[PDB]
Amino acid sequence: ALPTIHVVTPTYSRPVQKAELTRMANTLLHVPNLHWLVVEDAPRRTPLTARLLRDTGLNYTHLHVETPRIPRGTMQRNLALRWLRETFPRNSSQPGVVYFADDDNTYSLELFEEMRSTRRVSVWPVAFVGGLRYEAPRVNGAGKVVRWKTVFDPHRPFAIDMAGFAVNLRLILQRSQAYFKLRGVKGGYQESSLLRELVTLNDLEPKAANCTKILVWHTRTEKPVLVNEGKKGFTDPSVEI
Amino acid sequence: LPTIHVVTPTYSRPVQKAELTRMANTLLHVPNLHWLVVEDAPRRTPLTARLLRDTGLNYTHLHVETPRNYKLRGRIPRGTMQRNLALRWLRETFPRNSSQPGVVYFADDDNTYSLELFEEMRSTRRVSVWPVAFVGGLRYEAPRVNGAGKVVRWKTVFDPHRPFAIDMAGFAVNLRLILQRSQAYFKLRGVKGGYQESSLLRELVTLNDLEPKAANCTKILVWHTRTEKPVLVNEGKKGFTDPSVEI
């Protein structure tokens, strides 16, 4: 009865894409009962992503939706939520947990073991976010979340990064109209726009030893320097990177 | 199944644990792999010792401090002394005629490596080479091979005519060769930019003895990705988060 972890990964075409998806896939290959829901920000599924997913052997679902003329990945994560609701029935039986994992963060294997038992919504510290070494939920001696240890808008409903929480699939199916808000939404408030509709602070399940350990890092990859390619290009455009 | 000795120089900085963590997640899939982690530090750090122990990987934890003086400027490539320490350790641990099937690969802790890469380098007899993405100001640099299957040059814009126009992550060396050429180390000082790889390789082999990998050097199996410095401006001068919390 090991719950399935649906990892929702929005992605888009840029130089370092294949590298990011590659080291992420290498991490995910270690996780049992995993379903990788990859959603490309493109007018159609790209062959680069299709082939990489195909060759991993992982159980994946490859979707796509192009963002028109709002936080990156929003429409993509939203498409994943709709897919989940159109694929699994409200009062379904197959247990699952949903996690929104960008393709460039760094994930420890222990993170997945921690979120797998999520009953409602689970939370944990995330490194390198909010201009800090890490942001972390504030948990009391009783083990309940009572606040957020952050510097940027510490009073928002849920002051936590996308990579800091997971949701039991049941809640996603029940709250069928809850999506990430892309309309008039203040910075750093998108996570709240969804979580506020799904759970209350006191029902959050603190992970990572009552939020004292860092199991996930918000790593950013530098844009590669391609100046020597010139205007005409030097390397073979048909060679995939 | 030859053992792959992955030499990884590393040093303490904010993103270190994350780099080692995702690199470990990749290496854990590789059979018969020996991770030779060499820290730039006066002693083994608890962070690295603990991480290595918990991975479950076969490893050797070494360390040597790069003198503070060497890191200053009013040159010396990062990790040089650490890579050289690994070379010296291999020579002191394995007998010259060890014959023990092995390959040596210098893998920095921030690059991205595919699993296929390791199987390509595992069969190296002398020195193997392959394309590497995001180096030399290009999408990738790749060795150029002739119809006879021999490397005859390098597809690069920056000094393509140097002895070996290739990045650290683009080659592997048969352990036997390393043990035989006991005096070959990476140049320490006065290293001309982009010439350190050549400084070692020229003492180990000739162009004609290189073994092209990755579908005759037409595929990219390793990427020279660089991680951005995390913004810690909200920590203030007094610090906001707990310094005891390991990240």
UniProtKB/Swiss-Prot annotation, chain A:
It is an enzyme of class 2 (transferase). Its EC number is 2.4.1.135. The modification Phosphothreonine is found at residues 22, 27. Its cofactor is Mn(2+). The soluble form derives from the membrane form by proteolytic processing. One of its GO terms (cellular component) is membrane. Mainly expressed in the brain. Pathway: Protein modification; protein glycosylation. Residues 2-241 are lumenal. The record marks 135, 228 as: Interaction with galactose moiety of substrate glycoprotein. GO terms for biological process: carbohydrate metabolic process; chondroitin sulfate proteoglycan biosynthetic process; protein glycosylation; visual learning. Mn(2+) binds at residue 104. Glycans are attached at residues 59, 91, 210. Keywords: Endoplasmic reticulum, Glycoprotein, Golgi apparatus, Manganese, Membrane, Metal-binding, Phosphoprotein, Secreted, Signal-anchor, Transferase, Transmembrane, Transmembrane helix. One of its GO terms (molecular function) is metal ion binding. The keyword Phosphoprotein applies. It comes from the Eukaryota. UDP-alpha-D-glucuronate binds at residues 10-12, 41, 72, 77, 102-104, 218-220. Residues 152-161 are annotated as: Interaction with galactose moiety of substrate glycoprotein. It catalyses: 3-O-(beta-D-galactosyl-(1->3)-beta-D-galactosyl-(1->4)-beta-D-xylosyl)-L-seryl-[protein] + UDP-alpha-D-glucuronate = 3-O-(beta-D-GlcA-(1->3)-beta-D-Gal-(1->3)-beta-D-Gal-(1->4)-beta-D-Xyl)-L-seryl-[protein] + UDP + H(+). The active site is at residue 191. Involved in the biosynthesis of L2/HNK-1 carbohydrate epitope on glycoproteins. Can also play a role in glycosaminoglycan biosynthesis. Substrates include asialo-orosomucoid (ASOR), asialo-fetuin, and asialo-neural cell adhesion molecule. Requires sphingomyelin for activity: stearoyl-sphingomyelin was the most effective, followed by palmitoyl-sphingomyelin and lignoceroyl-sphingomyelin. Activity was demonstrated only for sphingomyelin with a saturated fatty acid and not for that with an unsaturated fatty acid, regardless of the length of the acyl group. Belongs to the glycosyltransferase 43 family. Homodimer. Interacts with SAR1A. This is Galactosylgalactosylxylosylprotein 3-beta-glucuronosyltransferase 1. It comes from Homo sapiens.
